Amino acid sequence: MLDAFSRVVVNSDAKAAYVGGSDLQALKSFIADGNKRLDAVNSIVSNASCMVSDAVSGMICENPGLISPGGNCYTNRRMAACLRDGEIILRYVSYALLAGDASVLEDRCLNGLKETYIALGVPTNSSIRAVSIMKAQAVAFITNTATERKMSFAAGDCTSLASEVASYFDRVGAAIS
Amino acid sequence: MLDAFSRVVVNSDAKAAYVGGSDLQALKSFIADGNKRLDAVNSIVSNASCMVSDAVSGMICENPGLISPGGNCYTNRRMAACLRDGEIILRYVSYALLAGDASVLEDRCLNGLKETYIALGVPTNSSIRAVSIMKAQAVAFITNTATERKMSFAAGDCTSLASEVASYFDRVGAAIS
Amino acid sequence: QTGLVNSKFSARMAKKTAKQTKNKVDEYMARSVQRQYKQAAVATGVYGTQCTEGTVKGAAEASRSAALSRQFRIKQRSAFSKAHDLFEFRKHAIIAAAGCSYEEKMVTRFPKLAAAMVLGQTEMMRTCSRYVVPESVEEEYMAASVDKQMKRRGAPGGVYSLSCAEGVAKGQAEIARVSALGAAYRAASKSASAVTAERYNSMAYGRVHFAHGCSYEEQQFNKYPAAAAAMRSDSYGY
Amino acid sequence: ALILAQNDHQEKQYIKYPKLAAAALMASTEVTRACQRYAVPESIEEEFLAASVDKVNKMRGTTASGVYKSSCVEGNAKGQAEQARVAALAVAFRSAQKSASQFAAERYAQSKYGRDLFSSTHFEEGYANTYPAMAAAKRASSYGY
Amino acid sequence: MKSVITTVVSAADAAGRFPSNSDLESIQGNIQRSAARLEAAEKLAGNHEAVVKEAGDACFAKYAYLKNPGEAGENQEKINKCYRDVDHYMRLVNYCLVVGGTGPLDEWGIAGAREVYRTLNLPTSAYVASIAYTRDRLCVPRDMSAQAGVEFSAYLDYLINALS
Amino acid sequence: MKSVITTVVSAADAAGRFPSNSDLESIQGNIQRSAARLEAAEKLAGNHEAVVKEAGDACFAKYAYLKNPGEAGENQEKINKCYRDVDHYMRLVNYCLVVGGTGPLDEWGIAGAREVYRTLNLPTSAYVASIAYTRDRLCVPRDMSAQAGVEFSAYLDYLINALS
Amino acid sequence: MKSVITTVVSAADAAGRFPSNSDLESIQGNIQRSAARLEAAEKLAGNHEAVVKEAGDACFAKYAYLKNPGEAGENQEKINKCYRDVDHYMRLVNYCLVVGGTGPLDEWGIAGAREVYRTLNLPTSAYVASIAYTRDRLCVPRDMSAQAGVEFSAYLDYLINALS
Amino acid sequence: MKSVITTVVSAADAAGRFPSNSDLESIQGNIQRSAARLEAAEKLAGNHEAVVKEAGDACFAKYAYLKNPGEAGENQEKINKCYRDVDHYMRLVNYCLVVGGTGPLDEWGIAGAREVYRTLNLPTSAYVASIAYTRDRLCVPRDMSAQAGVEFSAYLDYLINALS
């Protein structure tokens, strides 16, 4: 497990160096953009039980062929599995939202997830739909452009926080396919 | 495990009444001197390893009848096992010292250890000497009257929260005896 | 080029073969069922103290090099002792799948998932060895009566085996000594509602996994539950 | 070539023109990857079983007395023979770099390649069904290697 | 009682270590943000008997079919067991901004709460029709300070998303 | 490795939940302390090889016997190999002051130390004869400030609290 | 307690076995070697006041720096108790000779060793410094035999190699 | 294969110890004891065609009901599958003279032997009849010497104690 405060002490390690005075600029900017970085998470996880139900039904009204027999989401048991793994995925990109590094996920969720939907035969293109539709709600929650919840905030720059939740969300799609 | 935050609400629900503004007499004060709390807990860990050679070796010099054949602490298997459990009564109270309540220690240590102090041969007489000096040193280590060390402090008052280090280490003898 | 045997120098086949991917889908499925049982251990964000790693200056780091080198011994087994616990772990893991055909689809598929789910179900219900101690010598001589019976599979012909091996270096099992005696104290001061399920489910843990028809042994379990909380399978020699 | 021709014209094209019947064999193994240079063995016994057959395939790169033929030869100039070695490993790193869909295709093909041209009995088409790379290393005896 | 600082010191028990500098700096943040919510506590706690008369029927404006013959909110011993119970959930979250952690949430409204709602045959979607109307009744001018309805707002829809 | 957030993100990982308001406040002390806690990063990293010379021979001031044959410091490169390590010891605690958590000093330096110093036959007090010269060479206003200064000594004697 | 004989009973305890013709056959060697190892048991005991004194300061003849205050080896009351420790070391090394193994030394000396020399900040190689004077001082034609000189010295270096 | 060597190294293996003083004298008794345990082995090997034959028909002399139809002696080949099964045991107890423990007997000869016989309808009361005939037929000046006859007898009755 690593993060952006401890990524530099990995980076300074292998060349046998320290945390130099000019490398602090990503991290001195962190603690001042941390007051808005904590203002970003509670916008997401307040509505979180809807976020999987908004998205996986968005795969249902996109593709209704999966709730037929033969589909991987037919039976009443397997949708209890699916909604469970739907809300796993944003539970771990929310960790990297507070951590600022990808070293939370492909050591805890992505290492071998490509191969463990291989033997279960889970259609990986359908899981991409359950990744991107969650991502679309995420950037609309950060920039508050989603229609039917208006949350109070402090004004200022937030345009780069939604820029990185794209980078985490497509990565979990990048490694499942 | 509670803290002094969650100590006071277990009786408020026991009368089912809401936390009033009359209840803010303790809560204005505790957050205000909260920096006066952990500015002494730095001193508690900063003499961790030397503590089990201060009061415990201050016990064998009070009574040398324990190192010869005929003592409970005769071999190194029980020489260490007296001072190994010396530092645990340092350790468990440090969680409770900042907590403002002994809910951390008194379930995981003080409940059950009295009967664990039954079956062994550990003397009731030497069960109270170390807990006084390691109270009376932390009485000094709050007050910085250590005769060979005066460390860094934001100087002023700290003897108000020196009342807890006497109010904590009395229930050791009140519940083991 | 030619074969690896003659007329060629360096190694080949940097490609995950069909057996090699079977191990990884086993391991990912096993880490999931490992972490899922520990979610049942700590059910809040406040840690239950049965997750207490070590309790002195160095016992927490000391538990690391013992646990993986013990796992090295489970990897170091013979062809017989690997074929035995293949078939033996799974039919215990069949039994924990109480009335589910779906779980016994994939427990005959992934033998490490069979291995990873049988022992963690015990640690969820704390129906195992160091989680429940008897109350008097009424049951103390009874609970440790099967303890000398269990290690008969350990040393088969007098000569000891690597199942019950404790330390691989100088001064290792002596930190394991003082640790589990603290667990023997950590088993002594649990909650009131806690301990009144460890006994009343270890007397159900034996009656499904070990009894199989004997109504005499059900008298033994339902009056002495701590004698059943030591009973384990043939795969652990100890 | 007579036992892979689909037409009766294609049969006549191989009988009369011998340089076509040669390269019609060779081109079939390139596209349906049943060469040695495309076969990765999936086990340590197969890497022994493939090694067991090309010890006989290299044994016709020498004469009846054991002196070397002109066929199996890996160099002609100062440094070329070492350059053939550093060449052939990049073939080998890319033979094991196929897609997941193309390892499946030549798995059935090399099994089909061995039991069509070299096998005449039931045990001979048992080593081809079970280990494809052992059947993929069966050369065509007009080479030396 | 899940709290802020009980969540810290337990891994120093669970891995067995001493309190270092890294363990105490988390409670340096328990000075400022601990203060800003405690104004919103008694601002709500003095008036908990009044805000239930628009919170309870906000479900019953939506779900008046629970007053049918043979139902869950049908009659006066169930009505006065309804109007008694709608503020119990707020006394849970009244103590939430007292400690700062989610203590009485995860102690007295989680375990079996999905069970006994189905088992006593009362709708789980009824309380979310009773308490989101309370949370969607925020006028930060006449309520409190600016930030005091930010963490406090996050509890009132936590129970929306946890319970259903 | 271990950070300020690593415990409170694993306290929601082992629980398997999204982060509640308990650990939402956990990063509040991360930003109130960083005003002067990485002050001693490049102040140290701009002055690190002055104090390797200052305290690195102040262990040979206490124990001036090490040049005898048989023990470690008897030739030129072996004491030159010492000065690498006493650089390393405020390397991986200078990492710790900006990491916040106590990860990479345990992950690399302080754990496993008892087993390798026993084998390589060198006293662990012969290290702390150097480290204990450093903290009483720090000045309270001159080198850094006070709240900067408390996060230098309490890492420095926490070192020897786990070396002794 | 470990010896020749208390090994093979606990070996043949858990196997459900009666001691067969290897278990007793190991003790068949343990009677003739007991003549050669208890020849050295009481010559150590009959002259034990020799080794406690001009080896304990000969220990100090290569660790002489402990005599300074600040350290723990400086004054006479910490010589009054200092020579008492090697009295427990010359006692415990005598009792291994009447057992047949390293039983009483490992049970009484090694268990709890590594944690009280360093929490007392005693340099643990100085507890080895006496033993090196003891080893090659016992010559062959004078003190012990040739076959008793080897095995007491084989009992001796167990106290060397376990301490550091 | 439980030998007088292998019984002690596994005891020090699992505890993680070197070959110590408990292990030096444990195999001291494998020369002066095996100065006589080999003496039965070359006596058994040069006279095995007669010893097996004498103990063979001593079984059929006692229980002459094996010849009947239905039992374990009714045909010529079941006569040879009995005279073979004592030549196996007169090799296995020859082998554990050479081992010096129970190794060849307890692993390859008696382990699960009480399942093959009870399923194949073999009277294990006749196996002890055919072994015990030679258990007294040894003559302490004539078969071997008395330091070898107590050795050879002690391996037979251990097999008799097993099957009974």
Ligand SMILES: *C(=C)C1=C(C)[C@@H](Cc2[nH]c(/C=C3N=C(/C=C4\NC(=O)[C@H](C)[C@H]4CC)C(C)=C\3CCC(=O)O)c(CCC(=O)O)c2C)NC1=O
């Ligand atoms: C099928 C016909 C179909 C759907 C199901 C649905 C899925 C979908 N939704 C969006 C956009 C949003 N989804 C949101 C989630 C929720 N909205 C709510 O009101 C609650 C709080 C929550 C569910 C518990 C949100 C907030 C948005 C953003 C818009 C907004 O301001 O509300 C998408 C992507 C964009 C789109 O297609 O509209 C999809 C696929 N849409 C369907 O067509």
Ligand SMILES: *CCC1=C(C)C(=O)N[C@H]1Cc1[nH]c(/C=C2\N=C(C[C@H]3NC(=O)C(CC)=C3C)C(C)=C2CCC(=O)O)c(CCC(=O)O)c1C
């Ligand atoms: C039930 C709670 C729990 C979970 C989940 C878990 O993973 N462990 C327990 C409690 C716990 N343990 C630690 C820290 C450590 N635990 C180990 C042992 C494991 N780590 C290993 O590498 C191996 C070998 C495969 C094992 C068995 C170790 C070595 C540590 C680190 C201690 C040290 O080395 O100094 C923690 C604390 C994590 C944190 O927040 O820092 C907890 C809660």
Ligand SMILES: *C[C@@H](*)C1=C(C)C(=O)N[C@H]1Cc1[nH]c(/C=C2\N=C(C[C@H]3NC(=O)C(CC)=C3C)C(C)=C2CCC(=O)O)c(CCC(=O)O)c1C
């Ligand atoms: C279950 C396998 C077994 C048999 C059979 C047996 O006799 N003992 C166990 C394992 C075993 N252990 C040793 C040596 C030691 N074992 C311990 C264990 C105790 N210490 C603890 O902290 C705990 C947990 C409560 C226990 C049970 C100790 C201290 C030793 C001494 C280590 C040493 O001296 O090297 C052995 C081999 C030697 C022996 O006869 O005990 C075995 C097989």
Ligand SMILES: *[C@@H](C)C1=C(C)C(=O)N[C@H]1Cc1[nH]c(/C=C2\N=C(C[C@H]3NC(=O)C(CC)=C3C)C(C)=C2CCC(=O)O)c(CCC(=O)O)c1C
């Ligand atoms: C032809 C197939 C051969 C038969 C039959 C045989 O017994 N040996 C083959 C011919 C041959 N080659 C050499 C020497 C070299 N051959 C080299 C090429 C191999 N090394 C590689 O890395 C690869 C690809 C993976 C191949 C094919 C190299 C290089 C040499 C060394 C050249 C040099 O100048 O030393 C010989 C001579 C005997 C020997 O093995 O050196 C023969 C007979």
Ligand SMILES: *[C@@H](C)[C@H]1/C(=C/C2=NC(=C\c3[nH]c(C[C@H]4NC(=O)C(C=C)=C4C)c(C)c3CCC(=O)O)/C(CCC(=O)O)=C2C)NC(=O)[C@@H]1C
């Ligand atoms: C004659 C005095 C016996 C008797 C012997 C029979 N044994 C038969 C089969 C048999 N016996 C064994 C055990 C033996 N064989 C071994 O290789 C070893 C150890 C190295 C031992 C101890 C086995 C395993 C078997 C089955 C396989 C085989 O044929 O060898 C047997 C035939 C049984 C049958 O045909 O039904 C006979 C007659 N029977 C007696 O009653 C006395 C005791």
Ligand SMILES: *[C@H](C)[C@H]1/C(=C/C2=NC(=C\c3[nH]c(C[C@H]4NC(=O)C(C=C)=C4C)c(C)c3CCC(=O)O)/C(CCC(=O)O)=C2C)NC(=O)[C@@H]1C
């Ligand atoms: C009866 C309990 C088992 C058993 C288990 C062993 N545990 C050993 C180490 C160990 N295991 C845990 C439990 C951890 N794994 C989980 O799956 C869960 C919850 C679902 C938890 C908390 C802990 C905390 C520890 C260290 C403490 C300890 O047990 O001493 C272990 C190795 C030896 C050892 O150190 O104990 C074993 C063998 N023992 C048994 O025989 C049955 C299978």
Ligand SMILES: *[C@H](C)[C@H]1/C(=C/C2=NC(=C\c3[nH]c(C[C@H]4NC(=O)C(C=C)=C4C)c(C)c3CCC(=O)O)/C(CCC(=O)O)=C2C)NC(=O)[C@@H]1C
């Ligand atoms: C009216 C708007 C509600 C409603 C209220 C009812 N609750 C009934 C029983 C009940 N509910 C709980 C859960 C809640 N009440 C509490 O007092 C506490 C904590 C202390 C909690 C979490 C409990 C514990 C109980 C039993 C004791 C009690 O009366 O409080 C109930 C009776 C149903 C029946 O008897 O069948 C009613 C009418 N029920 C509704 O359906 C709407 C949404």
Ligand SMILES: *[C@H](C)[C@H]1/C(=C/C2=NC(=C\c3[nH]c(C[C@H]4NC(=O)C(C=C)=C4C)c(C)c3CCC(=O)O)/C(CCC(=O)O)=C2C)NC(=O)[C@@H]1C
């Ligand atoms: C100097 C102040 C000490 C002293 C130092 C010596 N250390 C020697 C060897 C050594 N030390 C370590 C651990 C250390 N090196 C690291 O890179 C790190 C972590 C970043 C640590 C904690 C290692 C791994 C080694 C072996 C490799 C090497 O340095 O050559 C050493 C030489 C012993 C030898 O190799 O014979 C010395 C002299 N010893 C002293 O007496 C003073 C007090």
Ligand SMILES: *[C@H](C)[C@H]1/C(=C/C2=NC(=C\c3[nH]c(C[C@H]4NC(=O)C(C=C)=C4C)c(C)c3CCC(=O)O)/C(CCC(=O)O)=C2C)NC(=O)[C@@H]1C
């Ligand atoms: C003298 C050459 C040493 C030295 C010796 C000191 N040891 C002190 C205390 C101490 N020593 C031991 C080890 C030994 N004594 C025992 O009784 C047993 C087991 C039966 C052993 C192995 C122990 C366990 C202790 C602590 C308890 C006790 O006093 O017996 C000591 C006093 C220290 C103090 O008063 O704090 C001294 C001076 N110290 C030196 O500096 C040189 C190297």
Ligand SMILES: C=CC1=C(C)[C@@H](Cc2[nH]c(/C=C3N=C(/C=C4\NC(=O)[C@H](C)[C@H]4CC)C(C)=C\3CCC(=O)O)c(CCC(=O)O)c2C)NC1=O
């Ligand atoms: C423990 C709980 C806890 C938190 C959650 C944060 C809450 C928090 N966020 C901001 C403050 C802010 N938050 C934002 C963020 C945003 N504004 C937008 O329009 C976007 C929707 C969104 C970015 C995605 C911005 C832009 C600021 C102003 C910059 C700043 O004050 O640092 C502030 C300072 C202003 C104020 O007083 O409110 C605080 C206290 N701090 C805490 O102590």
Ligand SMILES: C=CC1=C(C)[C@@H](Cc2[nH]c(/C=C3N=C(/C=C4\NC(=O)[C@H](C)[C@H]4CC)C(C)=C\3CCC(=O)O)c(CCC(=O)O)c2C)NC1=O
């Ligand atoms: C810690 C790692 C971890 C994960 C990554 C998730 C994901 C995950 N899901 C399943 C198991 C499953 N996962 C799904 C989900 C889906 N199938 C689809 O076609 C859709 C793309 C998607 C719906 C959202 C289904 C349907 C099953 C069950 C299949 C079945 O019942 O046959 C499994 C195997 C375990 C089991 O079968 O019980 C895992 C690991 N859960 C975890 O614990």
Ligand SMILES: C=CC1=C(C)[C@@H](Cc2[nH]c(/C=C3N=C(/C=C4\NC(=O)[C@H](C)[C@H]4CC)C(C)=C\3CCC(=O)O)c(CCC(=O)O)c2C)NC1=O
């Ligand atoms: C027979 C032997 C014997 C001893 C060793 C001492 C042990 C000892 N010290 C103190 C009293 C104290 N003990 C310490 C402890 C220490 N001081 C430090 O600098 C270190 C951190 C740590 C030792 C490693 C401190 C700080 C005080 C308070 C007075 C002071 O030293 O300033 C007390 C209680 C009150 C007193 O009498 O002073 C005792 C019993 N006394 C004895 O009778």
Ligand SMILES: C=CC1=C(C)[C@@H](Cc2[nH]c(/C=C3N=C(/C=C4\NC(=O)[C@H](C)[C@H]4CC)C(C)=C\3CCC(=O)O)c(CCC(=O)O)c2C)NC1=O
């Ligand atoms: C997270 C890191 C962290 C720490 C390391 C400690 C360190 C610490 N202590 C105080 C601050 C203080 N500390 C003391 C303490 C004392 N005065 C005395 O005379 C006694 C010797 C001693 C304890 C008994 C007093 C009196 C104050 C000022 C009053 C107050 O802060 O309430 C302050 C605030 C003042 C400042 O900004 O410098 C800090 C950061 N607290 C923290 O938050």
Ligand SMILES: C=CC1=C(C)[C@@H](Cc2[nH]c(/C=C3N=C(/C=C4\NC(=O)[C@H](C)[C@H]4CC)C(C)=C\3CCC(=O)O)c(CCC(=O)O)c2C)NC1=O
């Ligand atoms: C258990 C048996 C046993 C011993 C041998 C002695 C070991 C021993 N010998 C001497 C004292 C002596 N020890 C020896 C013996 C030897 N000197 C050498 O140079 C050789 C290495 C070795 C003979 C091979 C001699 C010759 C003396 C006389 C003075 C001296 O040389 O040191 C002393 C110092 C006290 C004294 O003056 O007696 C001691 C502890 N003590 C014992 O308890």
